[PDB]
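Researcher: Next entry in the queue.
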Amino acid sequence: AMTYHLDVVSAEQQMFSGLVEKIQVTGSEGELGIYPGHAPLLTAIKPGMIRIVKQHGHEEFIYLSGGILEVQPGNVTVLADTAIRGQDLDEARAMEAKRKAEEHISSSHGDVDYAQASAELAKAIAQLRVIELTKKAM
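Model: Structure for this entry, 138 residues:
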């Protein structure tokens, strides 16, 4: 037994809702997703990109800027707001955002001032990793 059901929706959209084998979430605090035998996590998901291996067929890559998730005895549900797919709409434009974001982090001072924006920058770079992968999945 190694296949479970996971549902992840943001605001008003379906990112992944059905049978799944293993999902890997990469954001910042905890590079873990969900699998058949995960701990009872009832907190907030980390913002970044997530790779989900479908129970059978192919695998998909989703992106979310944060949300709440809950694990159940056989299934797992998660709710977030900013939702994006590896190839949501614009592909090359994802790089423009990074370049424009670099400028904002080029200078500043303080401990949690610009350093906080750094987490926001990496957040936008997470979706750039899934779009590069979709290129080699066709």
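Model: The chain has two helices and eight strands.
Researcher: Noted, moving on.
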